[PDB]
Design a protein around this ligand. Structure first.
Ligand SMILES: COc1cc(C(=O)N2CC[C@@H](O)[C@H](C)C2)cc2oc(NCc3cccc(Cl)c3)nc12
Ligand SMILES: *[C@@H]1O[C@H](CO)[C@@H](O)[C@H](O)[C@H]1NC(C)=O
Lengths: 250, 27, 11
């Protein structure tokens, strides 16, 4: 996260680190949606162009964390993956359309002051909250700038951007399964996700019921925090038929 | 039933330092 | 060792 600040303790209790076993390194962010299910970006797990194709036994999920590198004994909990489920129409070839995947943990994780699930939006929350100008919050342990790394979990609040402006920022084709977010140049505040933040949550706090909803998944951008560019997020609500479908069947 | 209510914030009625920025953008 | 060692039970 570029131009963010340190998270408060327990600020983002749904944050998950996807951690590679060998070499031991940060793979991506992710989020906890129940005691056994974790949400992330498909391209955290599968992306042929960069020869990424992670199997269950390659990775671990670290929940309850604040410090990036330390083992937070008797705070964090580390979970093994039972199974990965990638959206069957995830378009890695062109534009990261439907950049979404689920991971079922081997055992349920115990909730705690530091570990707690985020809500998924329903159609009404989406329609209420996913509006140009409305801010969400993006958290992660990714780079502090494009071209270094945080001691602790970083947070930034960013406005959702009008769809034409998102389109006009890029040569990539933007689908209804994505929204972008970020300050414009003339807004003179900044902030963005960056490398290692992919997979992590874009959350909003509903003013109607005072709960947090994951509206987005950190997906992609062209550089980090550049003037005139924005971050692109998976639209969680548009893909919730699939989420429900996976969770109901498995 | 408990989703999105943080044990250290909503659960104890404490606000984090920037959640008001979000609220203020919601209209 | 950029990351601190995880307990071996998780590996
Ligand atoms: C394969 O994954 C990625 C690709 C690309 C990429 O160079 N693209 C050009 C070609 C096009 O096909 C791709 C759709 C995007 C950029 C990525 O940035 C990230 N994560 C970092 C991050 C940084 C800034 C903002 C946010 Cl929301 C995210 N994951 C990326
Ligand atoms: C990814 O790996 C799985 C299992 O190893 C394999 O079945 C799948 O086709 C692979 N896809 C690649 C390498 O693009």
């Amino acid at each position: 996260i570029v131009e963010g600040s340190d998270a408060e303790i327990g600020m983002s209790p749904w944050q998950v680190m996807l951690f590679r076993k060998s070499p031991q390194e940060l793979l991506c962010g992710a989020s906890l949606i129940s005691d056994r299910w974790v949400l992330t970006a498909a391209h955290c797990l599968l992306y042929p162009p960069w020869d990424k194709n992670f199997t269950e036994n390659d990775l671990l999920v670290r929940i309850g964390k604040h410090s990036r590198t330390r083992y937070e004994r008797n705070i964090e909990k580390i979970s093994m993956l039972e199974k990965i489920y990638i959206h069957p129409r995830y378009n890695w070839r062109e534009n990261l359309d439907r950049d979404i995947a689920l991971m079922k943990l081997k055992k349920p994780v115990a909730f705690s002051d530091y570990i707690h699930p985020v809500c998924l939006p329903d159609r009404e929350t989406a329609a209420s909250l996913l509006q140009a100008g409305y801010k969400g919050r993006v958290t992660g342990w990714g780079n502090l700038k494009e071209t270094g790394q945080p001691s602790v979990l970083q947070v930034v609040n960013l406005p959702i951007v009008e769809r034409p402006v998102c389109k006009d920022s890029t040569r990539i084709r933007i689908t209804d399964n994505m929204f972008c977010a970020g300050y414009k140049p003339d807004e003179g505040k900044r902030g963005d996700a960056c490398e290692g933040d992919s997979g992590g949550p874009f959350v909003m706090k509903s003013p109607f019921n005072n709960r947090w909803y994951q509206m987005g998944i950190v997906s992609w951008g062209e550089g980090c925090d550049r003037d005139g560019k924005y971050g692109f997020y998976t639209h969680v609500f548009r893909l919730k038929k699939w989420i429900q479908k996976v969770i109901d069947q498995f | 039933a408990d989703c999105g209510l943080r044990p250290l914030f909503e659960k104890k009625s404490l606000e984090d330092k920037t959640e008001r920025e979000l609220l203020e953008s919601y209209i | 060792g950029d990351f601190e060692e995880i307990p071996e039970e998780y590996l």
